[PDB]
Scaffold this active site. Structure first.
Site, PDB file in Angstrom:
ATOM      1  N   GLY A  13       0.891  -1.050   0.081  1.00  0.00           N
ATOM      2  CA  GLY A  13       0.183   0.155   0.033  1.00  0.00           C
ATOM      3  C   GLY A  13       0.825   1.248  -0.015  1.00  0.00           C
ATOM      4  N   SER A  14       0.326   2.471  -0.251  1.00  0.00           N
ATOM      5  CA  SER A  14       0.853   3.633  -0.254  1.00  0.00           C
ATOM      6  C   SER A  14      -0.223   4.715   0.011  1.00  0.00           C
ATOM      7  CB  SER A  14       1.577   4.133  -1.424  1.00  0.00           C
ATOM      8  OG  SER A  14       1.045   4.890  -2.283  1.00  0.00           O
ATOM      9  N   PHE A  17       0.983   7.704   5.043  1.00  0.00           N
ATOM     10  CA  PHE A  17       2.108   6.817   5.655  1.00  0.00           C
ATOM     11  C   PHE A  17       3.508   6.738   4.714  1.00  0.00           C
ATOM     12  CE2 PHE A  17       0.992   3.036   3.842  1.00  0.00           C
ATOM     13  CZ  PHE A  17      -0.529   3.003   3.423  1.00  0.00           C
ATOM     14  N   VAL A  20       4.330   0.853   1.697  1.00  0.00           N
ATOM     15  CA  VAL A  20       4.798  -0.247   2.393  1.00  0.00           C
ATOM     16  C   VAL A  20       4.886  -1.403   1.322  1.00  0.00           C
ATOM     17  CG1 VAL A  20       4.381  -1.789   4.378  1.00  0.00           C
ATOM     18  CG2 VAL A  20       3.696   0.651   4.333  1.00  0.00           C
ATOM     19  N   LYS A  35       8.664  -0.480   5.021  1.00  0.00           N
ATOM     20  CA  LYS A  35       8.182   0.986   4.899  1.00  0.00           C
ATOM     21  C   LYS A  35       9.050   2.265   4.720  1.00  0.00           C
ATOM     22  CE  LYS A  35       4.918   4.025   7.573  1.00  0.00           C
ATOM     23  NZ  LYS A  35       3.985   4.137   8.613  1.00  0.00           N
ATOM     24  N   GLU A  89       7.503  -6.200  11.614  1.00  0.00           N
ATOM     25  CA  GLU A  89       7.032  -7.607  11.394  1.00  0.00           C
ATOM     26  C   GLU A  89       5.927  -7.829  10.776  1.00  0.00           C
ATOM     27  OE1 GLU A  89       5.766  -9.141  15.347  1.00  0.00           O
ATOM     28  OE2 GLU A  89       4.659  -7.379  15.771  1.00  0.00           O
ATOM     29  N   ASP A  96      -6.466  -6.378   6.833  1.00  0.00           N
ATOM     30  CA  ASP A  96      -6.630  -5.009   8.008  1.00  0.00           C
ATOM     31  C   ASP A  96      -8.221  -4.810   8.108  1.00  0.00           C
ATOM     32  OD1 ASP A  96      -8.132  -3.147   6.152  1.00  0.00           O
ATOM     33  OD2 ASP A  96      -6.625  -2.378   5.582  1.00  0.00           O
ATOM     34  N   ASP A 135      -4.306   7.709  15.840  1.00  0.00           N
ATOM     35  CA  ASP A 135      -4.970   7.571  14.730  1.00  0.00           C
ATOM     36  C   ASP A 135      -5.620   6.214  14.700  1.00  0.00           C
ATOM     37  OD1 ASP A 135      -6.086   8.180  12.043  1.00  0.00           O
ATOM     38  OD2 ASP A 135      -3.885   7.465  11.397  1.00  0.00           O
TER      39      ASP A 135
HETATM   40  C1  HUL Z   1       3.699   0.745  11.181  1.00  0.00           C
HETATM   41  O1  HUL Z   1       3.408   1.151  10.104  1.00  0.00           O
HETATM   42  C2  HUL Z   1       2.730   0.260   9.197  1.00  0.00           C
HETATM   43  C3  HUL Z   1       2.012   0.930   8.018  1.00  0.00           C
HETATM   44  O2  HUL Z   1       1.703   2.293   7.875  1.00  0.00           O
HETATM   45  C4  HUL Z   1       1.450  -0.076   7.121  1.00  0.00           C
HETATM   46  C5  HUL Z   1       1.541  -1.510   7.190  1.00  0.00           C
HETATM   47  O3  HUL Z   1       0.969  -2.264   6.461  1.00  0.00           O
HETATM   48  C6  HUL Z   1       0.938  -3.602   6.755  1.00  0.00           C
HETATM   49  C7  HUL Z   1       0.371  -4.236   5.654  1.00  0.00           C
HETATM   50  C8  HUL Z   1       0.759  -5.634   5.652  1.00  0.00           C
HETATM   51  C9  HUL Z   1      -0.346  -6.722   5.016  1.00  0.00           C
HETATM   52  C10 HUL Z   1      -1.288  -5.907   4.379  1.00  0.00           C
HETATM   53  O4  HUL Z   1      -2.032  -6.709   3.463  1.00  0.00           O
HETATM   54  C11 HUL Z   1      -1.400  -4.509   4.264  1.00  0.00           C
HETATM   55  C12 HUL Z   1      -0.629  -3.726   4.997  1.00  0.00           C
HETATM   56  C13 HUL Z   1       1.818  -4.297   7.472  1.00  0.00           C
HETATM   57  C14 HUL Z   1       2.722  -3.468   8.476  1.00  0.00           C
HETATM   58  O5  HUL Z   1       3.355  -3.718   9.202  1.00  0.00           O
HETATM   59  C15 HUL Z   1       2.580  -2.214   8.320  1.00  0.00           C
HETATM   60  C16 HUL Z   1       3.142  -1.021   9.223  1.00  0.00           C
HETATM   61  O6  HUL Z   1       3.843  -1.536  10.236  1.00  0.00           O
END
Ligand code: HUL
Length: 273
Positions: A13-14, A17, A20, A35, A89, A96, A135
């Site tokens: 995703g983007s 934040f 990632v 990230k 991790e 989500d 948040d």
């Molecule tokens: C702490 O900041 C973030 C953040 O901003 C987005 C993130 O997104 C994921 C993620 C994993 C699987 C998915 O299917 C979708 C998202 C894991 C993260 O750990 C994660 C994260 O630590």
């Protein structure tokens, strides 16, 4: 050397934040999330105990990332000329809470109870660690679908917890409390409790209760799905217009609606497998 230690996979995703990616740590195949946050887009900076200029997000993650939890754990970070890279991790398989609610609609109360309880435990952990997330919302909660365990993710709008007033906010507006909307002032704990009320409503109704500023400051809650009186009562309590009329975390967790929570594993067996 970031490029060496991790093998990068698909972009997860983007947005506000950063970007990632899915990744794996080469040394031991550990699943990770990678990230990237551009420096020129970081407003809030802090300092490690060591005394190095890093994003607040890194300071906060270090403070909470000690031990096990319902909080995402920072494994490592790296600085680049124009960005910071964070290694986190990554549970597998995962979804989500926003997508989970999109797919399944309003959650059964038993499931909302289990989820909400775990969010409360994670938020308490952050507060015990001196960190305010700022948040809390479904998009910032990951479900470990096999273990039934929830984890809090994006600390990009967070701050050190304090007992004096906050006059800055860059979290999600529709989860922000009336005192922020009207006066640009809130205290940390009671604002968190308001966002928890929004989240709980979101879980049991399948959507957030307020869209517009005027609805937020009016604070009248309409229930669009069948929700038990005890759950409605907890929600309305969390959404009290006066900050001091909101429950403490202790009071939320002692609420009659919060009794007899399922364990995470039972939660996955009954509702996720
Ligand atoms: C702490 O900041 C973030 C953040 O901003 C987005 C993130 O997104 C994921 C993620 C994993 C699987 C998915 O299917 C979708 C998202 C894991 C993260 O750990 C994660 C994260 O630590």
């Amino acid at each position: 050397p970031l490029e060496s230690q991790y093998q990068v996979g698909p972009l997860l995703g983007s947005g506000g934040f950063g970007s990632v990616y899915s990744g794996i740590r080469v040394s031991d195949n550990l699943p990770v999330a990678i990230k990237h946050v551009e420096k020129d887009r970081i407003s809030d900076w802090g300092e490690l105990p060591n005394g190095t200029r890093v994003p607040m997000e890194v300071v906060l993650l270090k403070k909470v990332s000690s031990g096990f939890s319902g909080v995402i754990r920072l494994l490592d970070w790296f600085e680049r000329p124009d960005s910071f890279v964070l290694i986190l991790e990554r549970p597998e398989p995962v979804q989500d809470l926003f997508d989970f609610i999109t797919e399944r609609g309003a959650l059964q109360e038993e499931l909302a109870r289990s989820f909400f309880w775990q969010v409360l435990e994670a938020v308490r952990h952050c507060h015990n660690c001196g960190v305010l997330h700022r948040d809390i919302k479904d998009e910032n909660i990951l479900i470990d679908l096999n273990r039934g365990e929830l984890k809090l993710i994006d600390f990009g709008s967070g701050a050190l917890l304090k007992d004096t007033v906050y006059t800055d906010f860059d979290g999600t507006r529709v989860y922000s409390p009336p005192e922020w909307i009207r006066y640009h002032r809130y205290h940390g704990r009671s604002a968190a409790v308001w966002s928890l009320g929004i989240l709980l409503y979101d879980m049991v109704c399948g959507d957030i209760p307020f869209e517009h500023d005027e609805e937020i400051i009016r604070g009248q809650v309409f229930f669009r799905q069948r929700v038990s009186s005890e759950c409605q009562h907890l929600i309305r309590w969390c959404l009290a217009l006066r900050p001091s009329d909101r429950p403490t975390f202790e009071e939320i967790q002692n609420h009659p609606w919060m009794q007899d929570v399922l364990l995470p594993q039972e939660t996955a067996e009954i509702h996720l497998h």
